């Protein structure tokens, strides 16, 4: 029972580097110049494009095994499009004044830069990442 | 000894389709070739004092990328050609492929 | 000298079954199978028969060796759902499937000509 | 034989035709290829004797060697052309065959990982799955040129609890190297459990490979 | 210089720099070698020597110290070898076979 | 020796079509690439079938015991 | 001398090897007719009784 | 008829190239295995050498017998020899040809399946003559004779599998193939400079809409659709060979449903 | 000396390879010399 | 910098921190004296010698 | 008089069954035919030197006051001390049953080689110069490719078959063709072994082609052209093919370069080499 | 060679001799054995040739 | 030439040739029926019940180390660390 982060975001670029699934995108905040985002997305599901905007909710609720449907007539938690699930490798870096945070979505990286997520964030694994258009 | 081009091979496509007749019919001959000064045998004491030719056509007087690069035909002085680079080979290696 | 009687691989020689049925330890509602003298043929078309089921959580099968005709299936139904009727009934659901191909292909077979 | 490394003991395994069968990560400890290569296999005959072949010369403790103060047993050929290929970010396993790659690794605990993605379509990793042949337990940082926390040519390396976070798994890691996951897993959880490794990465790597397809024509030797 | 030029260009998908990447048989010298030149061949570390006097074969002129007269193997192994190229890159190997026999019998004794 | 019945990769029936090639070759002077895909061999898989083998048999059949 | 160079060779066989990706990193695949070859000395053991028995 | 749909291309006595379309990969392969696999047919697995003056050896000889296919129509009508209570082969489980040649011209006496004859009686069922779709009524050329050089032989044509040996193997190529377009993007394409301008296009790249460029990578899309297209070998018509192959599959499951079944009781 | 072997009939090609090989008994001898072009195989 | 030595004790350390689930947040519990001494005193427990005369 | 046959190759990582040089080959092409071989041991054995009456005698020996035979059965030899062609000779069969009286039975005999079983091809008896009585005794082995079996291309890389795999299972082109013979991809930089590669361009070309083809050293044809021509056949010039797993039909996410290759099946075959003498 | 009867032999008069009409022949039967005189690589007569020679040498 | 128990200078660490020498001994008694130590809690294999009667510090060997000069240390197998 919870969700963690929230806002919407600017995509300032999308590096596509030798891939073909995947972009490494990097939006800015929509609100705070201290929020940035560095975001490794599957793009064949869900194509992300420079000037986007993307609601970036990062959560971590609704580990035993995983289920495939029987809750996606039910608990659907996900009134977003892309739904990663990652682990906290969080380096709360520390950084000069702001506090920059961590994740892995099985080798997609997530890397989240600002200040008031201290009691905002997890430092553990357990924490989703939503995407809605 | 040839007077129409420069040097070129005792050997001319007449020789040739002599030997060919002679392949069909079964009399011109590898003796003949011999006793007809196209063809000589060099030991490689006297092949010191030689210099001969990869390819006939080293003796003639853009490029595919796709073939090799082959060195010039900078000389007039070939004294013999190679009947064919492929016979430098043993009967083993005769076999391998490229 | 070696080499296994190719038949060993279809039929079965003696004290063998066809199915052995293990329930899995390490997960609740899990079993895993072993049929001997069967392969991916019959493996990789159950499996993604039993997968198609949603009442199914976990459907895998492999076989650990070349060498040997037999393969091991694990199938994991919800609780409450027994993975033998799981089985049953993706197995009837392959039965069934079939019938309709070879009906459908027996009946496209004669509106051909050659 | 050279080297303490070339008589090893193993399990024996009965097994149809003939030719003795090794693991292939076995291989270059006893610098064998398939060419041809004879081996020669003792069946110690007494009961210590039984015991000192298994205690001492047992091939899980082998892997580190005394030679270079490394592992001397890698992952390799088609297992490590493989690895590197299922690593990439761009690769992703479908329910389906997740399944099964994961039914492969026997040391599996059958929770079927929560998969990267769950978005449009339940899609994990190749490393996630990777991830299950590493144990708990099982951390490695390394870095390469220019490896960040972020990594941007997933470069370097790091696994943490046994899910490879980051980094291309190859030779680097996954080989016979200093520092590499099986120097880690030898050290950090025994002999035995990484011998085990061995098996579990090849099984799933190699059923992914299978699936997947490896190959090398002329075409691949054009400019 | 050769040599690099075609490995940076392989694509990663390119199957021989595929196995590279990944650690599994193949290094640098092997792309070289079948993609941008062979390289120079060499008999007791030194160009082909002039066997017959003065000049490497019979098929040169005599005191020619170019690449080609003296062993460069110009050619990728795609590209085929010349007969000289291929007597020469012939030379170079035997020279390899040879004292792969001598360091196989001389390291064979060392090591007992 | 003889045809082989069958294409080894896949197991088309071949060894009924060697004399009816070595017609298609012979009496009716046509060349070995047009006379494999006329018997049919189409997949170069059977075509090799054929077109390799050596009926060295016609030789053996030369020798008197 | 003769017996210090390791001639006559025993308990032992000797076979081309192959590759095998599904023996664990330990196991050695014997052939079966190999393995009928070789023998271990077992000493019959109330622990292991029918199995030896079995065997027999 | 709801569920998997065939859809003819061609069909001939030797082809059946069709379109399996609402399948499971699964199923499209399973039964592509069973053709070229599990097919029951009838081939000659024992050959009895009585005189062979012939050039070639005797096992030389018995192994292109066992090669050259057989008529396997009622081949249900037949037990395997394994099952059937009698001792070896009889009539029930067993045909029995012969090769009797003698080179008794000059010229080269070449010896064919033709030249085989069923010495055992069928009791009516189709089975067991030497296939011959020669147009020359010769089949399968066994032999070689020089005049003098004589062939006397037993064949015993038993019931097997693919499995068991390929030369009980009805089919003969299986062509087979799904997504023509790469859209489920099942393969990356390798290529020099273009993965398009390279690759030929395939057979069936007609029967189906080349994607639009715009699209998102259909994530969803399953295979179904496979172009098979099974090639006999003649012991059995083509068309039997497909129904078998969903026949013996169809068994096989059947198998197993009996063994969950008789699995419990005693 | 072994100067008469068993001629090798393993393969046609491997007996015609047999009656033109050739022996060196006991400076540089192993090696292929530049005047062996065209007389002896350099493979 | 890069020599080969028994412990990797950069591994022991990052098996603490992730067998203690140590935050980089809150300050550590430790003394000084637990430190300094601690490790003091630890060098003491490194035995490849067990002598207990002067030499040794 | 050619020695090896075209196997239809796929460079492939299969099922993990062909590294470090081993091959998977197919196993339904071996029992077609492919790479079998006759193989005729054929023994020799004369009769006594200079002994005055202790003559060797072809017969059959039935134990009297020595004993002294072999383990083999002598249930085969007729009563001229030979084995008759047509008559399966294994274990260690006695083939040329002989006897001496040594200063009444003392066997010495040549029994079938221990490893070795087969039939016998022709039994042959002659007379030398000082009129010794000859025997020759060809016996015949069909040899089938099995696992261990060593087989080499035309470029000094040989390799054993790992594992057959029947039809079913190979990996299988959208022509239904599947490959005799997987080897495997990572045999090919550190060799360099290039040859094999266009050779087996070409080897595809010519059979699609019936075109003998030249790959002769010093030619001008070129992987370029070789390539065009394939590509006019319609399979992609580069020799790669798409192709399906054969366990679930799904298609190989690799392109598999696919194409005949003249392999050779050389001797010193695995059941000569298995000698296992635990005692 | 010359002596022996196969070299005016023609094809049949081999197949008939069962002597494979491909056999070549640079060969010798010898107690039954085909033996091959291996081609003896000497150095030749009459030439003259210079040596230099090592430093501890008096020559 | 003996070394009293106190002052022993060796290792109290059983070392991995000790280990798989009684392992060895231990077993090669286990397998001729004589009596063992701990409760078979299902082990057949003799090995595997010599090493649960190490893991269970109930085997009733000494060691005995030699040192170069001849003279030893004696060390009980129950007073032997085994951490290899
Ligand atoms: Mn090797
Ligand atoms: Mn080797
Ligand atoms: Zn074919
Ligand atoms: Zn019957």
Known sequence: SNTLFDDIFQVSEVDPGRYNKVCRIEAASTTQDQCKLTLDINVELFPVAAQDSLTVTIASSLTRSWRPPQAGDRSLADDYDYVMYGTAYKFEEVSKDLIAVYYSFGGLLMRLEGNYRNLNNLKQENAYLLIRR | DESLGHKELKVRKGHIAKLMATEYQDEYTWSSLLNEGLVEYIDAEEEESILIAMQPEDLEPDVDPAKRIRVSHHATTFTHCEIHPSMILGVAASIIPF | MNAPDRFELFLLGEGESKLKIDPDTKAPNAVVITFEKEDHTLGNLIRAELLNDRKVLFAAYKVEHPFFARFKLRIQTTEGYDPKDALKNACNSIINKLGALKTNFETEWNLQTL | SLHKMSMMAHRVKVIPYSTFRLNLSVTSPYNADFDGDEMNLHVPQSEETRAELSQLCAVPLQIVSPQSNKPCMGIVQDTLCGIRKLTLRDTFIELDQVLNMLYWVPDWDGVIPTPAIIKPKPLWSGKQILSVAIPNGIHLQRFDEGTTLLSPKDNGMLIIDGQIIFGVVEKKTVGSSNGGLIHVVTREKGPQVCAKLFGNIQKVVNFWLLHNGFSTGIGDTIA | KAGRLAEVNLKDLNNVKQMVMAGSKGSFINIAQMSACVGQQS??????????????????????????????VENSYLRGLTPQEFFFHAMGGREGLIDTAVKTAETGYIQR | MIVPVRCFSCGKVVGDKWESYLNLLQEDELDEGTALSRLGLKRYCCRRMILTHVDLIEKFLRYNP | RGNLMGKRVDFSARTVISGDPNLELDQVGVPKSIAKTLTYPEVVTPYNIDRLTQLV | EEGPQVKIREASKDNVDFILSNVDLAMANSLRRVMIAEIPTLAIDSVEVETNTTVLADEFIAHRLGLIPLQSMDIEQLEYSRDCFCEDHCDKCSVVLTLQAFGESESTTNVYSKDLVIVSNLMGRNIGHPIIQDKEGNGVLICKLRKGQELKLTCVAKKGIAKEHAKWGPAAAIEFEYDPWNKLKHTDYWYEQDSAKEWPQSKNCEYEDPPNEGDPFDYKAQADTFYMNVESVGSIPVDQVVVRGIDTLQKKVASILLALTQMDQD | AGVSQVLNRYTYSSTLSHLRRTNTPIAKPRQLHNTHWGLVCPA | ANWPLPVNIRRIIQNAQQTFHIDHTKPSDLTIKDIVLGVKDLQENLLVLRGKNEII | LPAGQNAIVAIACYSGYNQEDSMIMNQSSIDRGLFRSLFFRSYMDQEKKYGMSITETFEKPQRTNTLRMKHGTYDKLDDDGLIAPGVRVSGEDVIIGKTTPISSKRDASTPLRSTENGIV??????????????????????????????????????????????????????????????????????????????????????????????????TDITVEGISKLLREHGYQSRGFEVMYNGHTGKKLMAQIFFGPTYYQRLRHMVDDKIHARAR | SKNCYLSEATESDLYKLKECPFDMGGYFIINGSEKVLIAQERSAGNIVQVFKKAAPSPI | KAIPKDQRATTPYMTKYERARILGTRALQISMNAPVFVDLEGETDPLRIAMKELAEKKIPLVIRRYLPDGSFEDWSVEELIVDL
């Open chain 5, 43 to 72: 008999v007791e570390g030194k160009r082909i020597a002039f066997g017959f006097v003065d000049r490497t074969l019979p098929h040169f002129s005599k005191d020619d110290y170019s690449p080609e007269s003296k062993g460069f």
């Open chain 11, 121 to 218: 091809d022709q039994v042959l008896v002659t007379t030398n110069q000082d009129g010794l009585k000859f025997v020759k005794v060809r016996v015949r082995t069909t040899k089938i490719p099995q696992i261990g079996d060593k087989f080499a291309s035309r470029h000094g890389q040989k390799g054993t078959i790992g594992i057959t795999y029947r039809r079913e299972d190979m990996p299988f082109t959208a022509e239904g063709i599947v490959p005799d013979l997987i080897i495997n991809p990572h045999a090919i930089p550190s060799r360099m072994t290039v040859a094999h590669l266009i050779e087996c361009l070409l080897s595809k070309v010519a059979a699609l082609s019936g075109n003998e083809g030249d790959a002769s050293p010093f």
